[PDB]
Amino acid sequence: SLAKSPASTIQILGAEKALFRALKTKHDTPKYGLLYHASLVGQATGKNKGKIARVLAAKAAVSLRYDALAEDRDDSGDIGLESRAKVENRLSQLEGRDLRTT
């Protein structure tokens, strides 16, 4: 059931109360859901937490689908490990940027 969900839902999976209140009352919607407690989101700071949740949820769907729907999956996590590296690179460059003029 999780594998058949889009990556956007996985981002905000645990925050239905805030989501559907906001959707019906024309206000901004949550951006973290249950993924807020993942390690990668914790490393991010400020608005970068919202971006990494978007990136991490997308890659989680990629890895999760490979877990659910793979007929001859190895019990190695290789797809997850390469997916993890992409998010860390995204975090590194995203955090490297400094808004204040130097």
Partner: protein
Amino acid sequence: NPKAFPLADAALTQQILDVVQQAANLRQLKKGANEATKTLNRGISEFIIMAADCEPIEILLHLPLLCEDKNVPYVFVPSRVALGRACGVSRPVIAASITTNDASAIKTQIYAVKDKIETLL
């Protein structure tokens, strides 16, 4: 790529990729597996195009499960780079969806291809 089924032949792919280009210019095209997954849930998808060379193929293999559940035609095309260019973007696309619109200017072409994909299934 045994899992990719049904896989369109060269003659049918050109017809599919022609509609995908026309749909893109009319803003009747949804690009990406995640954005294609939604259209199935909302019941607004004419049919789904998928790329057989996607690696790992499983990242798009949930759509056949959703498509057979909702009775939506789906077909595979050999190349994801070619699919992306047809969609009209600078990145490869592994999945796309044609959105339903009964007032569309390219309705006849979509239904013509849709019939061929049904025969293929």
